[model samples]
Target: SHANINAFKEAVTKIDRVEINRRLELAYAYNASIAGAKYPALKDPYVVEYARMLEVKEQIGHVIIPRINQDIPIYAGSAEENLQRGVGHLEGTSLPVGGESTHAVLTAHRGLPTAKLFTNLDKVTVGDRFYIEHIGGKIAYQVDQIKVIAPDQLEDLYVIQGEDHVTLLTCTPYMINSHRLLVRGKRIPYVEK
Candidate 1:
């Protein structure tokens, strides 16, 4: 089944044009900061503006989500999948793809795309591995701990700036959107095939 789709891997040879534009455009729009903050929500027509605050969300939606059809066999569903693609900085957004030490934090939604984004949170135990391929190089991360936070909690999500790590975040309480689930991982060396 995966044989025919192997040819589609050529798409990876070229810099994904759509992915590039989605990153630059979203970053450009948000960097301007001319628009007022506090968007209503994703339901509002103008809510697209809020995308700037959530770079990974847009990267996943614009660059990743669109390419997930059978044509592309390497698609990643959860943050774990993002790691597989070497999606550092969530492909350049508020979500830093690479971290300082051996760790990074990732956040996503539940019940979306069949909760395919963060549905694996419960399965992430200490010492699990995370991997990423970036322009700099491949990064390997190991899970150290997991934490559940309030949805409004922003302090834990901020990048350490000088540290290298991986963080996976998503909505909590299963069907409810009131809390956050965070997984902490540290970067290790990646072994290429």
Candidate 2:
């Protein structure tokens, strides 16, 4: 068991860092060019932040779901333990390939106890970092904001005027799963090793 655990750790460490950097650089440039040329009001801090989120969708498109692996969340669907199932069209389902620009809303069941989709979401805090790697590209996001809301709070899901952002959602209060915990993050310029 110890050897198996160690092997897993070593495998994770071997993920390609250079590929992550190259793709993230391209994502940042793509976002900046789009906003500057077409989205005038996006230059505002709040607006720009959400625009940065559009980059996140593009970034996630780069993440390669390993063969035989079913754990990572996929494009939203009806799976019982899927976090993105209820996210509708915002989770890259209908968007152009690598051109999706919106909040990456992902959801999962917090009540499943053993197989909870987003059971550990509550542990994420401001300034935490998460990464996605797809194909030859990779991008990372840094947590910048967190909000807890009642289940009826749909207003929180709307795109704020003139901002780019990532909002991660999961049922809250741990085992109870009554409220929802929403964590919002802005894209921090990512560095590739």
Candidate 3:
């Protein structure tokens, strides 16, 4: 995939709007398919078959956390390797590009020895702001909700009609994680800074 990554970089770095838009709409469909699923979790939130829509080993976007003072690249698929490098975009959900009726889940490890990752996730709070830098530019969101859940509790991460959302997820309790901490942000008007 060495050459493919370079090719991927080519399309992204050149600011090819058409290619970006085409892929993004396809991702929107992927997100919709998940939201439209019977359970959005129980039925089938993820379909690995739709991998072609975004391609494997692609960098979809970046999740910028001002609270943590970190900007993380969101790689495709929530695979083991993907999370190790940066952040992983959970496949069954909306792409991080953000739009109405879309909810994207960006997850990474916290308390790693080498990487900062989401180690400071606990410090994030309501009304705190962050933005996603995608192909279109930066789309902003404000923290509106936060929660903790077991790994089995998939209900916290799903779509809402006419609402744009992105949820930040990481293992909780730092070193001894028995639960998950979810920091959700609702899309707001993008303000240039």
Candidate 3 residues lying further than 4 Å off, grouped into runs, are 1-11, 42-57
* Model 2: lowest-lDDT 10 consecutive positions: 39-48
**lDDT score for candidate 2 against the true structure:** 0.45
Model 2, position 132, has a per-residue lDDT of: 43
- Which parts of model 1 have CA positions greater than 4 angstroms off? 1-9, 15-105, 112-115, 135-137
Prediction-by-prediction clash tally: 27, 18, 0
TM-score-superior candidate, 1 or 3: 3
CA lDDT of every candidate: 0.43, 0.45, 0.74
Model 2, 1-193: lDDT tens digits are: 1233233334434557775466456645644454344322211001122223223332223221122122342332323322333221132211212223434454545544444445567767787765544333345667789998877665666544365566666666876767778877665565856
Residue runs of model 2 more than 4 Å from their true location after superposition: 1-71, 78-101, 111-117
TM-score of each: 0.51, 0.52, 0.84
**lDDT comparing candidate 1 with the true structure:** 0.43
- Give the Å shift of residue 42 in candidate 2: 23
Best by lDDT: 3
Error of 1 at 63 (Å): 12
> Judged by lDDT relative to the true structure, which candidate is superior, 2 or 3?
3
How well is each residue in 15-79 modelled by candidate 3, as lDDT tens digits? 56687678778877777776676654532111344445555346666667888887776676677
